[PDB]
Point group: C3
Chain length 222, copies 3
């Protein structure tokens, strides 16, 4: 359509759509309770991402925010996505290591603060304060990874699986704050169609790529 980034919003829609169906079909048969939990959490992520990617493609998940003497197109639907999918992804990691709820509660709530403050920053009409919310949001992210590393006798199937997904999680997640900072939301460096491509490549890897590495392992069974 009229927006150059349309193609990446369409490709993301498409890829999130087929990953859900792939994980749906694969969960066909599963009766192991715990396996039943990873399949639930992991199928719902691109399911949710699917709808939010489609709401961006179709124009609904977009809004104008004025600042720097311009009217900026901001896709708020990403934060409706992450708000639910990022604790679900952290949920996947925690269950995996059998995290006590005290740690789960800090992960989920720090996660909500990260996204919520991510969202406020995205919609704030005063240019410099946008970067204050980013920083707060980055401290929550930097908190989660900390617990991801020093916040946790596991079976060696869960460990390796865990180490794999923890590194894939730090590398992709830590790229989101960078992308936002240089993109349309912040400094206006990287064009909106390139950032939409970066977020698409990260989203698909963080959800479907993350999902294929997880459900492909016996780490999920009890």
């Amino acid at each position: 359509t009229g927006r150059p980034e349309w193609i990446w919003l369409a490709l993301g829609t498409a890829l999130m759509g087929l990953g859900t169906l792939y994980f749906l079909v694969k969960g066909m048969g599963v009766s192991d309770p715990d396996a039943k939990k990873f399949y639930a959490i992991t199928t719902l992520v691109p399911a949710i991402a699917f709808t939010m990617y489609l709401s961006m493609l179709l124009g609904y998940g977009l809004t104008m925010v004025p600042f720097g003497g311009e009217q900026n197109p901001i896709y708020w639907a990403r934060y409706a996505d992450w708000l639910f999918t990022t604790p679900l992804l952290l949920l996947d990691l925690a269950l995996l290591v059998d995290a006590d709820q005290g740690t789960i509660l800090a992960l989920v709530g720090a996660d909500g603060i990260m996204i919520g403050t991510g969202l406020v920053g995205a919609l704030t009409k005063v240019y410099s304060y946008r970067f204050v919310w980013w920083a707060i949001s980055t401290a929550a992210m930097l908190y989660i990874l900390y617990v991801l590393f020093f916040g946790f006798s596991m079976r060696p199937e869960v460990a390796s699986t865990f180490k794999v997904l923890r590194n894939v999680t730090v590398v992709l997640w830590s790229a989101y704050p960078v992308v936002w900072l240089i993109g349309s939301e912040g400094a206006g460096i990287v064009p909106l169609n390139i950032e939409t491509l970066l977020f698409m490549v990260l989203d698909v890897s963080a959800k479907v790529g993350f999902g294929l590495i997880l459900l492909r392992s016996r780490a999920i069974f009890g």
Copy 2:
């Protein structure tokens, strides 16, 4: 008042109001833990519905959406209702059969997608895409019922009670997509005051009627 559908918004308010009070009083005494769970979930549903029905009566839960060359009155407060009351209703059914959390997590999250995509459809300004969100929302509904039927050795008190409420649940819930499709939200076939009556009759049966059949049985005790 000025809106013809006012009378059904007032009758729903009223009926949701007295069902909460009826279930509140009835839970007076209950000390059985599990009974304590069905009473919690089941009292909260028309409690929440009460407030959302009243916000519609008083005008707050309503907004204009433009499309088809008209300004359409859309009651968004229904989705604030369902978003919380429909997982609670599915929660009632699951606990009842002692569903593993893997199934509960898929039910609740598929439910959120159904309502959330229901909501996006309701507020989308491009007429044909309204029907795309409906369809997605109907696939999630059709998913839940599937699990409602083929997604689950229970005591025979829970089974019969369960079968009763599962059929009452498929019959009423499956009517909501029909009503939306022919009503103000979609094709503009059935007038807004008639749809408001249909949703009122379904809501009251799905919550209070569903609640009286459930808490009236010993299926709820352990």
Copy 3:
């Protein structure tokens, strides 16, 4: 800045900020699972309050609502705060007494109704109905305290700790409906900068003061 209440929004920001850091540092070391739960819930409260207090200071968590022939400044960010922090505070009390989930589910859901109806009232454009939502919201509050008192063999460390926090909870919480009624949201009696001071003093006591009395006791360990 230009708003006289700025100073109290800045002082609250500041105090919520240092209480989080204080509780964060203190949770450093903790490995007792249950202790890990009170520290999670209790650190997140002024953490969340911090962000919401800052969004009010910076102007984002504020909006104009017209009524009584005036344009009223309403800080909606308080309800984004409470919506998450008040069930967390009730969560702290319940875990403490080892509440069955039936009671927890009624507490959290009655709490959501209190805040949600608090919020609707705050944004309602018809002056008298504002007071209807308050009343409904006060019935939910009056419900929670009821369960706080007659809705529950505990260790005597939890009891005393519990009694302490239950009284501090009834006294501060019951003051919020009073403040709203006489402030900018309702009758327009107490000026906005004084109410912002009252809510600040209550918020800080209800969260950080409440937090220091709680985590300072061995009531939290198993």
